[PDB]
Curated annotation (Swiss-Prot), chain A:
A GO BP annotation: fatty acid biosynthetic process
Location of this chain's protein in the cell: Cytoplasm
SUPFAM superfamilies: Thiolase-like
Broad EC category: transferase
Main location: cytoplasm
Lipid biosynthesis in keyword set: yes
Name of the protein described by the UniProt record: 3-oxoacyl-[acyl-carrier-protein] synthase 1
Function text: Involved in the type II fatty acid elongation cycle. Catalyzes the elongation of a wide range of acyl-ACP by the addition of two carbons from malonyl-ACP to an acyl acceptor. Can also use unsaturated fatty acids. Catalyzes a key reaction in unsaturated fatty acid (UFA) synthesis, the elongation of the cis-3-decenoyl-ACP produced by FabA.
Residue ranges of domain Ketosynthase family 3 (KS3) in the record: 1-403
Gene Ontology cellular component terms for the protein in this record: cytosol
Swiss-Prot record, chain B:
Keyword Transmembrane helix tagged: no
BP GO terms, sorted: fatty acid biosynthetic process
Protein's name in the database: 3-oxoacyl-[acyl-carrier-protein] synthase 1
CDD domains: KAS_I_II
UniProt xrefs under PROSITE patterns: KS3_1, KS3_2
The family this protein is said to belong to: Belongs to the thiolase-like superfamily. Beta-ketoacyl-ACP synthases family.
Catalytic residue positions: 163 (for beta-ketoacyl synthase activity), 298 (for beta-ketoacyl synthase activity), 333 (for beta-ketoacyl synthase activity)
Keyword hit for Nucleus: no
């Protein structure tokens, strides 16, 4: 069947508003975490986040942005970057049945769903709500808000699977190319950052709460003193393209998606089973004749979760384990956008021949014993890289990307 | 070239809590719409809804239901029925890497997103939120709350595409079968019914508001006096199974999914273009050389939308227009749960040989002249049926199902 490659990328994250700023941040191990007055004022215990530092005012036409929540805004900007980076013009991708879009968010828009209810409960009711809340809230906001202004005619929907969201979007995009249904599928996602949603995670005891005085050190994946994840917002989009179609137009090909694993734990609602991850990673490596050189781990900086993945990694590789780093230590956990942002961080490592450092590890965790956790920006000629995304509900996604031959 | 068939179904809707109650409603042209004091008290203009008439208390283990919003509950109850209907023992589908679940909702849980925020702003803060709001409020709630209790090991995620949601879930499940990745995929969706979400629709003018005194008359697809859809909730699940796997275990097969269209309008944010729908139905019909005997329309009872669909149907079928009925006039529009529920109503019509009536058409819209809109229950041997789901954001899905020989 058909092979799929990535021919363009775009990103708006806590560590950079485009691939150049993100590349700079990754090489220097710069943290995108800051103190959040909004979270403190809301009454939360976690006072830090991986916020997008960008004034998006006037970046999107009013008639388009009026329908959008922040998740869509971020994904929209990311898609604009990916389209340019791919060297694509309207004539090639708009009004074309063979071009699609699969992009989602993990939470939709808790901020606008709450704005809707607050406004409706006020004296103006429906008038205060306005006619734009359905497209801002609504789990498919990200796909709907982008497909329309970009004149997408092919496939159009959102997949959501919590933290694995945008990784499943990419994988489904790959399947569309393999099934011969689409020549190009823009795949990614976005996630707003707001106390409305962050508090649900804090109420769950899932967010870091001991490092509010030193934001940049709160996300500390693999560190013995990790106490939860730092929530983040952002967006990402990659252009997934059928190989012959890409070669035929002289596209710049970052890599081929040679493996995609999607499995389920069928065990715990919030913690990973590990058994699911093992199968997912193996499914993704199946048939890949080259070793994994780098693995961007799921590790969100939580006690059990970090340990569960490492064990799964040991089970899959043994002593032949790849270089490992958790960019989450610098970026925070962007939920729905995490899969595509991490697939991007990984393509930038594959593209620029380096491994970003897993920062804030002051004392490695006993579980990471027989594994190579890279903690300093390291130059290396990577060929095959893997990225794991494991979300609540026991849902797993692993993407394997390789330089083309 | 693997083929996908439906071997079990389950449903919780405004017109029945299982396929038997639903079958009766369909044949009787029975409305599931009722007056809603909750919508009225919330300040909405639309005071009618297609509510699930069932108290779900205690039907799900306390430790499982604690993570669930209503969409997940409806979907869970639906999947239990689907599993029993498919004759699948636990050993046949649990802890099995070749068995998956793709199910979603259009809105996740606006009720719980709002609850978490209201609680957080109150005197107990985090303590009032509780540790279960995430799995209730997240967009993948429906897949997450089911995959876990049912011990699903294969694919696990939700697709969300507004009104087309569960129809894309079914199509994606077919794709897993065709890719040879799964032997069985449970596909479906659920949607809660609450003023928190409903007012958003009312605020954009999408809901019927002129028939609150006669709730059963508010949903009237194709009627000249339609004035918006009637929101509903509920769930549905079908067992999508690879054909060889179904035949080997003696599965009862309702039909084969012989066509699946998924397209995008790339035009207007809330109005259909018609053009995408045309491509969607044509894509679903590719290589299907039997005629469409019955088409379950998307027609949600809106002025603009009902006609764009009729125009698309006219374009796709020309002279070979199939019999058509909008079960929506009876059920209301269940958003994320609609695609699977209408696929199920279509399968029931196919299994039992009848076409359910498109009720409440007191004055047929002029642009519907010449089509075969069925307005009275009609017995007829059906072989191939089509069901459309066209949602906001210009997202389209069409499913074509066909009876197998013997
Ligand atoms: N990752
Ligand atoms: N339908």
């Amino acid at each position: 069947m058909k092979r799929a490659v990535i021919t363009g990328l775009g990103i708006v994250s806590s560590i950079g508003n485009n691939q150049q700023e993100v590349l700079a941040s990754l090489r220097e191990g710069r943290s995108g975490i800051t103190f959040s007055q909004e979270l403190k004022d809301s009454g939360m215990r976690s006072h830090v986040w991986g916020n997008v530092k960008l004034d998006t005012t006037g970046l999107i036409d009013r008639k388009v942005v009026r329908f959008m929540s922040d998740a869509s805004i971020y994904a929209f900007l990311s898609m604009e970057q990916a389209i340019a980076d791919a060297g694509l013009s309207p004539e090639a991708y708009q009004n074309n049945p063979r071009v699609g879009l699969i992009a989602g968010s993990g939470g939709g828009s808790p901020r606008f769903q709450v704005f809707g209810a607050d406004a409706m409960r006020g004296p103006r009711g429906l008038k205060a709500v306005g006619p734009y809340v359905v497209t801002k809230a609504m789990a498919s906001g990200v796909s709907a808000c982008l497909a329309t202004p970009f004149k997408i005619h092919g496939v159009n929907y959102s997949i959501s699977s919590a933290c694995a969201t945008s990784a499943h979007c990419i994988g489904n995009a790959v399947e569309q190319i393999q099934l011969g249904k689409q020549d190009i599928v823009f795949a990614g996602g976005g996630e707003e950052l707001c106390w409305e949603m962050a508090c649900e995670f804090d109420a769950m005891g899932a967010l870091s709460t001991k490092y509010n005085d030193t934001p940049e050190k709160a996300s500390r994946t693999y560190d013995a003193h990790r106490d939860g994840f730092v929530i983040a917002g952002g967006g990402g989009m990659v252009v997934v393209e059928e190989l012959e179609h890409a070669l035929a137009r002289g596209a710049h090909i970052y890599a081929e998606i040679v493996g995609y694993g999607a499995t389920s734990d069928g065990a715990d609602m919030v913690a990973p089973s590990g058994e699911g991850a093992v199968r997912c990673m193996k499914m993704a490596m199946h048939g890949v004749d080259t070793p994994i050189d780098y693995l961007n781990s799921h590790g969100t900086s939580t006690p059990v979760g970090d340990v569960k993945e490492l064990a799964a990694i040991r089970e899959v590789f043994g002593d032949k384990s790849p270089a490992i780093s958790a960019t989450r230590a610098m970026t925070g956990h962007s939920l729905g956008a995490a899969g595509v942002q991490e697939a991007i961080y990984s393509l930038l490592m594959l593209e620029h021949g380096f491994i970003a450092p897993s920062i804030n590890i002051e004392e490695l965790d006993e579980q990471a014993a027989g594994l190579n956790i890279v903690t300093e920006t390291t130059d290396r000629e990577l060929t095959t890289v893997m990225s794991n995304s494991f979300g609540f509900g026991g849902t797993n996604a692993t993407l394997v990307m390789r330089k083309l031959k």
